[PDB]
Design a protein around this motif. Structure first.
Motif, PDB file in Angstrom:
ATOM      1  N   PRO A   1       0.828  -1.218   0.000  1.00 39.41           N
ATOM      2  CA  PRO A   1       0.000   0.000   0.000  1.00 39.41           C
ATOM      3  C   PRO A   1       0.866   1.274   0.000  1.00 39.41           C
ATOM      4  CG  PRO A   1      -0.577  -1.466   1.793  1.00 39.41           C
ATOM      5  CD  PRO A   1       0.670  -1.986   1.230  1.00 39.41           C
ATOM      6  N   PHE A   2       2.094   1.189   0.533  1.00 40.65           N
ATOM      7  CA  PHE A   2       3.016   2.335   0.426  1.00 40.65           C
ATOM      8  C   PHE A   2       3.428   2.671  -1.017  1.00 40.65           C
ATOM      9  CE2 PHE A   2       3.701   0.384   4.579  1.00 40.65           C
ATOM     10  CZ  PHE A   2       3.149   1.431   5.360  1.00 40.65           C
ATOM     11  N   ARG A   3       3.620   1.657  -1.851  1.00 40.40           N
ATOM     12  CA  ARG A   3       4.014   1.773  -3.231  1.00 40.40           C
ATOM     13  C   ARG A   3       2.814   1.923  -4.155  1.00 40.40           C
ATOM     14  NH1 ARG A   3       3.771   1.902  -7.789  1.00 40.40           N
ATOM     15  NH2 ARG A   3       4.901   0.782  -9.461  1.00 40.40           N
TER      16      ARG A   3
ATOM     17  N   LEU B   1       3.801   9.579   4.956  1.00 40.39           N
ATOM     18  CA  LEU B   1       3.578  10.145   3.616  1.00 40.39           C
ATOM     19  C   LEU B   1       4.807  10.826   3.024  1.00 40.39           C
ATOM     20  CD1 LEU B   1      -0.077  11.392   4.127  1.00 40.39           C
ATOM     21  CD2 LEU B   1       0.721   9.374   2.831  1.00 40.39           C
ATOM     22  N   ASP B   2       5.539  11.550   3.876  1.00 38.92           N
ATOM     23  CA  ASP B   2       6.817  12.122   3.408  1.00 38.92           C
ATOM     24  C   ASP B   2       7.777  11.056   2.977  1.00 38.92           C
ATOM     25  OD1 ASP B   2       5.984  14.841   3.692  1.00 38.92           O
ATOM     26  OD2 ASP B   2       6.557  14.818   5.805  1.00 38.92           O
ATOM     27  N   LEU B   3       7.911   9.922   3.733  1.00 41.63           N
ATOM     28  CA  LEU B   3       8.812   8.834   3.279  1.00 41.63           C
ATOM     29  C   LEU B   3       8.398   8.221   1.927  1.00 41.63           C
ATOM     30  CD1 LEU B   3       9.463   7.196   6.792  1.00 41.63           C
ATOM     31  CD2 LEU B   3      11.305   7.864   5.153  1.00 41.63           C
ATOM     32  N   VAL B   4       7.095   7.981   1.792  1.00 41.52           N
ATOM     33  CA  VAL B   4       6.495   7.484   0.514  1.00 41.52           C
ATOM     34  C   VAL B   4       6.833   8.416  -0.705  1.00 41.52           C
ATOM     35  CG1 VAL B   4       4.198   7.062  -0.592  1.00 41.52           C
ATOM     36  CG2 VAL B   4       4.657   6.178   1.713  1.00 41.52           C
ATOM     37  N   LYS B   5       6.604   9.735  -0.584  1.00 36.75           N
ATOM     38  CA  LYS B   5       7.101  10.730  -1.640  1.00 36.75           C
ATOM     39  C   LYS B   5       8.522  10.442  -2.090  1.00 36.75           C
ATOM     40  N   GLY B   6       9.390  10.160  -1.122  1.00 38.70           N
ATOM     41  CA  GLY B   6      10.745   9.730  -1.407  1.00 38.70           C
ATOM     42  C   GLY B   6      10.984   8.381  -2.005  1.00 38.70           C
ATOM     43  N   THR B   7       9.902   7.593  -2.160  1.00 36.58           N
ATOM     44  CA  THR B   7       9.915   6.200  -2.577  1.00 36.58           C
ATOM     45  C   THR B   7      10.536   5.206  -1.552  1.00 36.58           C
ATOM     46  OG1 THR B   7      12.007   6.150  -3.693  1.00 36.58           O
ATOM     47  CG2 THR B   7      10.124   6.937  -5.002  1.00 36.58           C
ATOM     48  N   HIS B   8      10.590   5.617  -0.284  1.00 38.01           N
ATOM     49  CA  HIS B   8      11.148   4.822   0.806  1.00 38.01           C
ATOM     50  C   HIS B   8      10.004   4.087   1.479  1.00 38.01           C
ATOM     51  CE1 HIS B   8      14.526   7.346  -0.048  1.00 38.01           C
ATOM     52  NE2 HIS B   8      13.977   8.420   0.491  1.00 38.01           N
TER      53      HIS B   8
END
Ligand code: SF4
Ligand code: SF4
Lengths: 167, 162
Positions: free
Chosen positions: A95-97, A122-129
């Motif tokens: 779900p993060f990706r 959400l900030d980590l997800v923007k980074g693709t982490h």
């Protein structure tokens, strides 16, 4: 043979977002398409449980699922994230990706995560982490400051969650 | 039936619980310390250990459950076992010559045994247990930091069902 509802509580407490979602979908829809059956079924296999699909005598697709204590390999995080992107009838993936961030935000809210927790995720997800966002989710859920491992497998998440819940 | 997990116990149970299973199977009984250590471990894996009785009157079984399991430090630091007791952590509690014989019976290699004994002598019980995990699963590095028997089981299941 036992009903899937025996592990409802367990999914909430120790399943990563990607398996949690599959458990939910299986429970609400009484089925999952292949991708989901593989991802979730194989995850359960890794824990030592055998998921069983059955067709009910009266056949709603008419399937019923069960589990018991116990070929293909449980999927790692990179496998889930990088391959087999889910189509519309599918509940598998990460779900993060895979979730549109607005929808990811709403899922995380339904999970009672703190706004600061959500905002860091959400900030980590923007980074693709994706995996580090999932460690963050692990930390929020178990109320620990450092998960203490480097996440790379939904099955590892489970064992590490159980180890905390077991003292 | 308690015999249904004899095989599982050799493949995924840490030393401490594998010995409890063996003793319960052989002795048809375990004292309280043992029943608690092993019973709670089983609960952690989703099984309930109980003794079957006959309701009509004025055999140990295991079944799917319908209870917090002991951690490595709780087992190692407390309740040293007396004679008659089969609980505790073999790495900490067994005489090193008896531990060596137990590892031989587990088919650990001579080289494996020597590494484990050296670690026991330095009091690194968990790390010896991690070395045992690595040898029974034929993996060079377990990749986790072991502090709970149920974690050992959980990690073994990943390998075995991999
Ligand atoms: S990160 Fe790995 S574990 Fe966490 S959700 Fe995405 S896939 Fe499942
Ligand atoms: S180390 Fe922890 S797990 Fe390995 S045997 Fe001693 S207690 Fe059981």
């Amino acid at each position: 043979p036992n009903s899937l509802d025996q592990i409802d509580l367990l999914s909430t407490k120790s399943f990563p977002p990607c398996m949690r979602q599959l458990h939910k979908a299986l429970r609400e829809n009484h089925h999952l398409r292949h991708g989901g059956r593989m991802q979730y079924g194989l995850f359960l296999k890794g824990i030592g449980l055998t998921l069983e699909q059955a067709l009910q005598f009266w056949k709603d697709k008419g399937f019923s699922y069960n589990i018991r204590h116990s070929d293909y390999t449980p999927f790692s995080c990179l496998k889930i994230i990088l391959s087999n992107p889910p189509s519309q009838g599918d509940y598998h993936g990460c779900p993060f990706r895979h979730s549109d961030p607005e929808l990811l935000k709403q899922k995380l809210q339904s999970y009672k995560i703190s706004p600061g927790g959500i905002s860091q995720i959400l900030d980590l997800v923007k980074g693709t982490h994706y995996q580090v966002a999932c460690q963050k989710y692990f930390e929020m859920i178990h109320n620990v400051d450092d998960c203490g491992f480097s996440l790379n497998h939904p099955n590892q998440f489970f064992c590490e969650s159980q180890r905390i819940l077991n003292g």
